[model samples]
Target: KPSRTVEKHIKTKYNLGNANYRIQKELNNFLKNPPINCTIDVHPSNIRIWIVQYVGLENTIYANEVYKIKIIFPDNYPLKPPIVYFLQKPPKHTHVYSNGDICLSVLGDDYNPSLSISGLILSIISMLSSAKE
Candidate 1:
């Protein structure tokens, strides 16, 4: 079962409606089939916010390093992309800001409802792997 707080918020605060169903399904799917080299942590009080830890790809500048990212699903998720950004300290990359904001197309104009949490994580990993520096 997912968090009761999530359910409560869905029913009251967020009023997620169908989005709640989708979020629940995705959470279950994520637990069963998480992304490679990634692990997730969700606060029982706020399932809408996820903290993801991902290991840097092999042969990449960040090789063997672990980085944390924060993902906040909006009330209208699926219709809008989740707010994704590195946590604590941002990566030293051209596409990342000092404030942890990322300049990724998929998180912006390229966003599609079909994209899942795993897909977003993979895309971030791919972006990190392809960094010239």
Candidate 2:
């Protein structure tokens, strides 16, 4: 009786209520098979943390430039926003804050109950690519 009900609750909570898990799964899939020239690594500070490399084509200003972005995952992870910052500046790029903190809307938006980790990561990548004014 109690066990059956508990199991049902767990299933429902994870399957229907938690979109974050889905997002995490998507993120993992993306990480495993990333787009051309995109690379990511687990941060040394914590395995949950990650650093992604965003490099564009040679003809662009980002040519021959590599930028390191630090992604800090929360304990709740997929359910919350990752604190993303740049570890090293890209050559000739000055849009990033001197301290490494990136200014982006996905990370700046107020906390919402529906946000997921996968969506957040995608957002970060998209913004980073369009960082130039």
Candidate 3:
């Protein structure tokens, strides 16, 4: 059995009120009906961090290339957008920074509490599909 201190830490780490509840539901929904060419990896110990892998779309410059993105949910998620960025090497796109930051309205000014994780991934896919190069 784990020590009391360890148990306490786990409780504190995972006990995020409404944020955790929403995240759990969103994760379940995504796992049940995931988007095509996309997959997500989340640690059982920590639900706040997510690694998403997306396959490049056909007819795009990134076709067949796999891209990974890192998303970290804040303590007040849904009320705020998660911190999302590409991993290692980001795709070459006008809105993607060399440091992996993606410029998307939904992630910024257009953010809405109603948007789900699946919606975020779909938006990214749409952005990648529209890239001219």
Candidate 4:
């Protein structure tokens, strides 16, 4: 059971400064439950998230790869956009930045706050599969 202070804190403060309330509300759903074969974890650092892709597409050059992608939430969150980094091995796509930063527009000006994390991930997979060599 949460202490009174903890409960009060959540009630009074948690939503007060939530810039990403729309997404934060869904975060519980996103965290407690996620798609099978895919896992999302908030790292202890809190600055980054770990996404493990176990099964999805193995038909692309990356189909056989087990990827650990990183997600970073901005101080501004949904108002801006979280940075998603793909830590590539033997890097194939040109859209990959030097620091494993993905060039996908989902993290760019094209981002829609309405897009769910699942949608974003799927979009990335689509990008990886169809990206020009």
List TM-score per model, in order: 0.81, 0.60, 0.83, 0.66
Summarize candidate 3's per-residue lDDT along 1-133 as a digit string, tens digits: 1111111112333344668878877776677666667877776678788888888877788899999988889988989898888999899998899999999999879998898887887788888887476
| After superposition, candidate 2 runs with Cα above 4 Å error | 1-27, 33-36, 90-95, 110-133
Model 1 misplacement above 4 A: 1-17
Record all residue pairs in model 3 with backbone atoms less than 3 Å apart, i.e. clashing. none
Per-residue lDDT of 1-133 in model 2, one digit per residue for the tens?
1111111112222344444454345445545556445566553333455566666656554665666666676666555666767776533344457778766666758645355544555565555454554
Ranking according to lDDT, highest score first = 3, 1, 4, 2
What's the TM for model 1?
A: 0.81
lDDT of 1 at 58: 79
Q: How far is candidate 1 from the true structure (C-alpha RMSD, Å)?
A: 4.6
Clash counts per candidate, in order, are: 0, 0, 0, 1
Best by TM-score: 3
Whose lDDT is greatest here?
Answer: 3
Residue-level lDDT for 102 in candidate 2:
61
Query: How close to the true structure is residue 31 of candidate 4, measured as C-alpha lDDT?
Result: 50
Evaluation by lDDT, superior candidate among 1 and 3: 3
The Cα local distance difference test for each model comes to: 0.77, 0.54, 0.78, 0.57
